[PDB]
Design a protein around this ligand. Structure first.
Ligand SMILES: CC(=O)N[C@@H]1[C@@H](O)[C@H](O)[C@@H](CO)O[C@H]1O
Ligand SMILES: CC(=O)N[C@@H]1[C@@H](O)[C@H](O)[C@@H](CO)O[C@H]1O
Ligand SMILES: *[C@@H]1O[C@H](CO)[C@@H](O)[C@H](O)[C@H]1NC(C)=O
Lengths: 50, 28
């Protein structure tokens, strides 16, 4: 990101902070939320198998 | 004669001075 010298952080449209200027090293870092995904379970009937 | 166009001003200075203002001057 082309962060301008004054800019402290950026946001997702949900207000949740997308990226931050680190307070000890002036690097601009993205904050992605930790890895997730929906768990569909595919099964015969328990009448047939577990 | 102010030139027609668009350009976004960037914050360069923050003054935590708390001063009451209502008038001003320019220094040629
Ligand atoms: C434990 C249990 O419920 N087993 C039934 C079995 O008795 C029945 O004949 C079959 C029909 O397809 O479905 C299963
Ligand atoms: C925040 C503050 O102090 N504002 C004052 C305002 O009430 C007053 O009427 C004016 C007089 O010129 O000076 C300024
Ligand atoms: C904080 O400390 C480190 C180690 O001395 C230094 O390199 C860094 O520039 C300091 N950060 C700020 C914002 O002054």
């Amino acid at each position: 990101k082309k962060f301008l010298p004054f800019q402290q952080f950026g946001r997702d449209i949900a207000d949740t902070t997308d990226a931050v200027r680190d307070p000890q090293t002036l690097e601009i870092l993205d904050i992605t939320p930790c890895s997730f995904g929906g768990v569909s379970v595919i099964t015969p009937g328990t009448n047939t198998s577990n | 004669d102010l030139p027609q166009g668009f350009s976004a001003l960037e914050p360069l200075v923050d003054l935590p001075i708390g001063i009451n203002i209502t008038r001003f001057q320019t220094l040629l």
